[PDB]
Amino acid sequence: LVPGEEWEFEVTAFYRGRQVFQQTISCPEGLRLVGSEVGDRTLPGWPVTLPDPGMSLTDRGVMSYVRHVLSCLGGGLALWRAGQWLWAQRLGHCHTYWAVSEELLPNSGHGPDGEVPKDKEGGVFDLGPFIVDLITFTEGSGRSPRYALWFCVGESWPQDQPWTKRLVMVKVVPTCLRALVEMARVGGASELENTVDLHIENS
């Protein structure tokens, strides 16, 4: 637990689809998404406190349920890198489902990639397939590799309803992965589909 496996993360939280928090954090111990006081620093991982919904929202009903979910985070959602994998573990009472997706839309309904385990850690991202897909993306394919981890907290994965209906959604992006894919775009790679049909008058 000392070499070059520290990944910087951009953490963006959405209460009811609205962005209420964003921070870019690089920590060798990884992160712990929590929702309260951090007097429990007996736990490893940089504690990222999700904001009280009173700071941003006016909907009282949403405010109540978000506050309750944040309350039950306890030890929080843990995220760290070890080897070629990203590891997540649910330390509190909030069930947490995850998916590797686009940077802007967690998307549905191809379903959640899985549920973050509690009793033990679980791999939620393999760097291997990313790099393979990245290389092929640079070779003229239209498929850009996905590096954005989305987390639905305290509710089931938004499999049919819009993700904006979920009380607490969190996107985590390994900034180094983002930069790699950007280097590909600058290199000449494009995500534009050949199925693009412009609706423009020609007379």
Binding site: E8, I135, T138, C176, A179, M183, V186
Partner: protein, 42 residues
């Protein structure tokens, strides 16, 4: 220097951490480095 060349081709600003982490993935994946080199030439 070849790695340093790839870093320069980055529009967005970046922390020393981010940049180092990119470099680590490059040093660890020579086939990825080749992918980028082949992209800018042929």
């Amino acid at each position: 220097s070849a790695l340093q060349d790839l870093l320069r081709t980055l529009k967005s600003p970046s922390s020393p951490q981010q940049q180092q982490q990119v470099l680590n993935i490059l040093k660890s994946n020579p086939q990825l480095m080749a992918a980028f080199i082949k992209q800018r030439t042929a």
